[PDB]
């Protein structure tokens, strides 16, 4: 809807794409492709979590 | 310069916007925002680190 940068953030990926050695665009896409799977996982990982407690519950229940 | 995203990470980066409840666009603008973080402080500690041994050396010499 309406995509929020502070003007003291915007300076901060200037300066980590200059410390990476790579432009700000693709500073940018780099990182939300790589939290993009850290993401996935963390989520894969829970809801495996979730289907072991309700595995253990259908037991416990019967 | 030729920002390059494979269609297999297009998926990753809206799969793991919908996980996070928030647009392609602000997921990708808040992931690149924390990482540029994240690089900014391994950088601060590898300098750092570089002024110890040049501290160390400086005496060394001497
Ligand atoms: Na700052
Ligand atoms: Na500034
Ligand atoms: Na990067
Ligand atoms: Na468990
Ligand atoms: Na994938
Ligand atoms: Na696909
Ligand atoms: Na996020
Ligand atoms: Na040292």
Same mark, same amino acid.
């Given at each position: %809807?309406? #995509?929020?940068?502070?003007?003291?953030?915007?300076? @901060? %990926?200037?300066?980590?794409?200059? %410390?990476?050695?790579?432009? *700000?665009?693709?500073? @940018?896409?780099?990182?939300?492709?790589?939290?993009?799977?850290? *993401?996935?996982?963390?989520?894969?990982? *829970? %809801? #495996?979590?979730?289907?072991?407690?309700?595995? *253990? @519950?259908?037991?416990?229940?019967?």
């Amino acid at each position: %809807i309406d #995509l929020r940068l502070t003007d003291d953030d915007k300076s @901060m %990926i200037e300066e980590a794409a200059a %410390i990476s050695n790579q432009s *700000v665009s693709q500073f @940018m896409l780099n990182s939300a492709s790589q939290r993009a799977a850290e *993401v996935i996982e963390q989520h894969r990982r *829970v %809801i #495996l979590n979730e289907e072991s407690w309700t595995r *253990v @519950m259908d037991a416990l229940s019967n």
